[PDB]
Design a protein around this ligand. Structure first.
Ligand SMILES: Cc1cnc(Nc2ccc(CC#N)cc2)nc1Nc1cc(C2CC2)[nH]n1
Ligand SMILES: [Cl-]
Length: 278
């Protein structure tokens, strides 16, 4: 195989990797790097071309294309450069220093996340997903581990990441929409199901569908058995609840679009610093 992207020699000439490993999966590792010229931080995502027997460069070219297509959306992580060596294609990506919104869903870090912030984070997530769906891209992997923050002290803006599952219109079980369990075709509605889960997790600090075992998880999804008890929802507003209950519905056709969701009353808010005109 001949290499397409810039050489590894250039990569090591222009960047230095740091000791902060940001993530590791079976065929991918992300590490922070720093430009030697400007000192600006990036995330270098190293993706193996060969997986489970399969030459996967084409699939990697597809993900690069999708990131490029979404370059103008500030809600989607920016792709700055690409390099390649014998086994890896390396993505130089915008650094999101706030880490994952999943961190804000753990009972640990949850007396520091107001209602205003959840409303704003969900609004931003919907703007990015609207932009993607307008372009016929369904993300298909919008777990809270895949939405980053530009900062957390203070709370910054959301960056959607990991387009490896992206398509035109069997992962972590608890985040799988029911239509995926039933093999139905890909729909924009699947991302909307996942937006329901993120709202549910930011607001309750619990997983809506996880069970003791995968078997129970799958039954929870296919039956849409979600806890909406007063214990879990005593400090969650009705409008937020309405938002979630409209997205977490079995029939994908009955879920509202991103567009309709952006007009939801839960998210209509006046910034009190501004002068309102009646
Ligand atoms: C501080 C930080 C903490 N945690 C993660 N988590 C994470 C989640 C999903 C993926 C999956 C992917 N890609 C990779 C890492 N990313 C961070 N910074 C990043 C990460 C990035 C780009 C996305 C890698 N920029 N800044
Ligand atoms: Cl990514």
């Amino acid at each position: 195989e001949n290499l397409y992207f810039q050489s590894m020699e250039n990569f090591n000439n222009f960047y230095i990797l740091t000791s902060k490993e940001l993530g590791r999966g079976k065929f991918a590792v992300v590490r922070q790097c720093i430009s030697k010229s400007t000192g600006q931080e990036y995330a270098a995502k190293f993706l193996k071309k060969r997986r489970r027997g399969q030459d996967c460069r084409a699939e990697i070219l597809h993900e690069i294309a999708v990131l490029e297509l979404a370059k103008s959306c500030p809600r989607v992580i920016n792709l700055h450069e690409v390099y390649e060596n014998t086994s890896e294609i390396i993505l130089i990506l915008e650094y999101a220093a706030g880490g994952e919104i999943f961190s804000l869903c753990l009972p640990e870090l949850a007396e520091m996340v107001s209602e205003n912030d959840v409303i704003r984070l969900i609004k931003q997530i919907l703007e990015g997903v609207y932009y993607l769906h307008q372009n016929n891209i369904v993300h298909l992997d919008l777990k809270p581990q895949n939405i980053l923050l530009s900062s957390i002290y203070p709370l910054g803006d959301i960056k959607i990441v990991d387009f490896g599952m992206s398509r035109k219109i069997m992962g972590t079980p608890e985040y799988l929409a029911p239509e995926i369990l039933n093999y139905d075709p890909i729909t924009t509605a699947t991302d909307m199901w996942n937006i329901g889960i993120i709202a549910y997790m930011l607001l309750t600090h619990t997983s809506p569908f996880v069970g003791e075992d995968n078997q129970e998880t799958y039954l929870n999804i296919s039956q849409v058995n979600v806890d909406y008890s007063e214990e879990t929802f005593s400090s969650v507003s009705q409008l937020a609840t309405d938002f979630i209950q409209s997205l977490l519905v079995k029939n994908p056709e009955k879920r509202p679009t991103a567009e309709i969701c952006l007009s939801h009353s839960w998210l209509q808010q006046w910034d009190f610093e501004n002068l309102f005109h009646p």
